[PDB]
Write a protein that binds this ligand. Sequence first.
Ligand SMILES: CC(=O)OC[C@@]1(C)C=Cc2c(c(C)cc3c2[nH]c2cc(O)ccc23)O1
Length: 483
Amino acid sequence: KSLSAAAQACVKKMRDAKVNEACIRTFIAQHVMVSKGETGSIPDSAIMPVDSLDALDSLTIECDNAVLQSTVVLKLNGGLGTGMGLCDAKTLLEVKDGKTFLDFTALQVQYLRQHCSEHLRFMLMDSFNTSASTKSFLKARYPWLYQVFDSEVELMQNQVPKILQDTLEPAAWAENPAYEWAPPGHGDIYTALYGSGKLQELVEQGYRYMFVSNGDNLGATIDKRVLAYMEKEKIDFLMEVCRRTESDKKGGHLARQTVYVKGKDGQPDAEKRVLLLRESAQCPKADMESFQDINKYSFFNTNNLWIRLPVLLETMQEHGGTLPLPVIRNEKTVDSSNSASPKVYQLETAMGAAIAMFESASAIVVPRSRFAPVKTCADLLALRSDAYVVTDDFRLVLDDRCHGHPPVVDLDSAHYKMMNGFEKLVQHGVPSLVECKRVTVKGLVQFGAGNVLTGTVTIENTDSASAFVIPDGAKLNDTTASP
Ligand SMILES: CC(=O)OC[C@@]1(C)C=Cc2c(c(C)cc3c2[nH]c2cc(O)ccc23)O1
């Protein structure tokens, strides 16, 4: 080997634990990079804003149903709802009418198979934490997915060791041999696809396109207009972006770099623009102000990505069976809670950063409805309510009586950040929010059954040693309800 002793210890620990060679190849290349000085930082001087992009609302032509016969739907399914106090797979959260996130995508795929394309493939990227519950859920409710779960559906996210910041050796932990491993970010989909052989199996069987998206994003549905736009424009990697708002100033954004290839002898000097992603972790403390300027950098990544699979395979093969994404170098501790434990580096990548790895890569701006993540219990309440309606093809869209905008829900963080607090609020029923512009709740409150809210409502309780109960049938119209 040409590896350092620290890197050697890393591969030895990973080979012992039966980690596959594609994950080892990819991690060690990041390890070598970090041992040569790479920090992950992207200053403002290194990038330019991106000003002009095509939009999805300018498109009208849909594709043939032949293209959908060669399309795979991949959902990220590694997330636990820890932010909402959950222990299990976020996708198994009841979101509307007794159905989960997973229910809706599976019903959307089931619909497309019967009506459009029987060979549309559905895959899930699971972690060790979400696999068993995901498998059990499919056994009970979707046996056609359960029968082919291991062979076709499930894609396992691998784990990588944390390394110390001084030696870059694999950190050891006597208490827990589990706190010495970590996930490598969702950029690991490429490593897992290639390393398991499933990417080769897919191109072999004739699949051309893959639509990847977060499992907790209900707006991420197949749109035939995007597939036609990729065919016609001969695009290999397409990222959906949205216009940034001040609510999104602390999240990542799209950026631009240029590569001048000099013309040999008497020639014209060529130009190629290259798109890239910059998240907050990659931004230096000095440039955080320019990071949050939503007029300089005005687009953010939805994680709705479209990939031409044969080109992905070829590009990874040309790199020796890996995709060399920019490494994000987290500075944390072996035990995350305890700041006495040794300082480590947690190396991860972002699947959206692959937009820089392709010549024919592009980004298309889409409406915000394509990015409807459920990350707070406030988002859940809006989605549970009649403000959202299911279509015949099992999508979730706003009711027309919402005038293009979901109701705005501000729930007290002291009582409703956790799911157990939120389910107490809607214990007797979730109110009608379809005609509601805004609703904000402060203090301990319980709705009643058959409640209807209109306009802008505020329900506040100042007494934290008490609960405010709203009776059944209560109508609340542009008011403040208080004890
Ligand atoms: C800002 C802008 O320039 O519009 C373009 C675009 C893509 C992005 C903004 C945007 C939108 C739609 C259809 C809905 C919302 C939205 N931003 C939101 C913020 C909210 O809090 C709630 C709902 C929305 O369209």
